[PDB]
Amino acid sequence: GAPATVTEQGEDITSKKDRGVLKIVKRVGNGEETPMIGDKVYVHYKGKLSNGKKFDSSHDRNEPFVFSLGKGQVIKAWDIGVATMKKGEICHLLCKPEYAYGSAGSLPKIPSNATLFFEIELLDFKGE
């Protein structure tokens, strides 16, 4: 399925080239611009664990997830991955635990040493 495909065929987008964050662009976005550090970004997403279970979805809340990029408000894989996205892009992101919740996990939903899969749509980004 999609998690296997990003694992096997995704691009390593880490600066360290440690295959900790892998990406496939699923829907090509607009032009060339990507958000910059500190921008307010609006996304829709769904996340899955490696046992196949969906653990979260913004779509199901009927409102986007909003954060300021590059500030550690989200897991490292998201600061790295969303920074690569164009407006309107949809991507798949595979996040090894070192770029997510590590050995601690995040109870109740995220176990220890969890590789996470996301589908992310970048709706908008704006400077404040």
Ligand X SMILES: O=C1[C@@H]2CCC[C@H]([C@@H](CO)CN1Cc1ccccn1)N2S(=O)(=O)c1cc(Cl)cc(Cl)c1
Using CB under 6 A, list all residues that contact ligand X. 47, 55-56, 65, 74-75, 78, 106, 109-110
Residues 6+ apart with CB under 8 A from 35: 41, 69, 82, 83, 85, 122, 125
Q: Which CB atom, from 12 or from 65, has the smaller least distance to ligand X? A: 65
Which of the residues 13, 75, 80, 110 is marked catalytic? 75
Alpha carbon distance 123, 108 (integer Å): 29
The strand pair at 40-48 and 65-68 is best described as: antiparallel
- Closest by alpha carbon to 4, among 105, 100, 92, 111? 92
CB of 57 to ligand X, least distance (A): 9
Is 101 annotated as catalytic? yes
Q: Which CB atom, from 31 or from 114, has the smaller least distance to ligand X? A: 114
Is 12 annotated as catalytic? no
Which of the residues 42, 45, 99, 125 is marked catalytic? 45
Q: Which CB atom, from 19 or from 44, has the smaller least distance to ligand X? A: 44
Is 117 annotated as catalytic? no
Is 75 annotated as catalytic? yes
| 126 exposure class (CB count in 10 Å sphere: 0-12, 13-18, 19+) | exposed
- Closest by alpha carbon to 93, among 121, 118, 69? 118
Is 90 annotated as catalytic? no
Which of the residues 55, 65, 67, 124 is marked catalytic? 55
- Residues noted as catalytic: 45, 55-56, 75, 101, 118
